[PDB]
Amino acid sequence: VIHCDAATICPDGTTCSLSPYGVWYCSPFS
């Protein structure tokens, strides 16, 4: 999976992206 900051997990296939309000979310890429 995707931990990145080791504080938020993400589905295998998404990248760690920070929101304009400091919110870690998974963004799908290809």
From Swiss-Prot:
Keyword Transcription regulation: no
Modification(s) after translation: Granulins are disulfide bridged.
Task performed by this protein: Granulins have possible cytokine-like activity. They may play a role in inflammation, wound repair, and tissue remodeling.
Name used for this protein in its record: Granulin-1
GO function terms (MF aspect): cytokine activity
Subcellular location: Secreted
Keyword Secreted: yes
Source superkingdom: Eukaryota
Residues of the full protein shown: 1 to 30 of 57
Any one GO CC term of the record: extracellular space
Lineage: Eukaryota, Metazoa, Chordata, Craniata, Vertebrata
Keyword list, A-Z: Cytokine, Disulfide bond, Secreted
Record-annotated disulphide pairs: C4-C16, C10-C26
Family to which the UniProt record says this protein belongs: Belongs to the granulin family.
Tissue specificity note: Ubiquitous.
Predominant cellular place of this UniProt entry's protein: secreted
